[PDB]
Curated annotation (Swiss-Prot):
Residues 3-82 form the PB1 domain. It comes from Homo sapiens. Binds both upstream activators and downstream substrates in multimolecular complexes. Part of a complex with MAP2K3, RAC1 and CCM2. Interacts with MAP2K5 and SPAG9. It is linked to Cerebral cavernous malformations 5: A form of cerebral cavernous malformations, a congenital vascular anomaly of the central nervous system that can result in hemorrhagic stroke, seizures, recurrent headaches, and focal neurologic deficits. The lesions are characterized by grossly enlarged blood vessels consisting of a single layer of endothelium and without any intervening neural tissue, ranging in diameter from a few millimeters to several centimeters. Component of a protein kinase signal transduction cascade. Mediates activation of the NF-kappa-B, AP1 and DDIT3 transcriptional regulators. Disulfide bonds: none annotated. Transmembrane segments: none annotated. This is Mitogen-activated protein kinase kinase kinase 3. Belongs to the protein kinase superfamily. STE Ser/Thr protein kinase family. MAP kinase kinase kinase subfamily.
Amino acid sequence: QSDVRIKFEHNGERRIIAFSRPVKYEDVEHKVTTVFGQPLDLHYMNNELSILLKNQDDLDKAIDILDRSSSMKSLRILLLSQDRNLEHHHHHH
């Protein structure tokens, strides 16, 4: 019970990667950053709305909903090259 199947896509190139539970954002992010060699951002798109992965809270919510949905199987994540977005602070709460 520890092998999540995640599908990553970069510039049209798709790849199949498995992650043994518990799946941590640090482990996943560290792998993506090393493979591509850059701080890429993960975007979780459900269908109608888009969620940005900033912390574990975002990933935890995404996995919780995905697991709840028996219909769903793989994870749809979009990789983007967003290394430092200008010199400022963006906080909303």
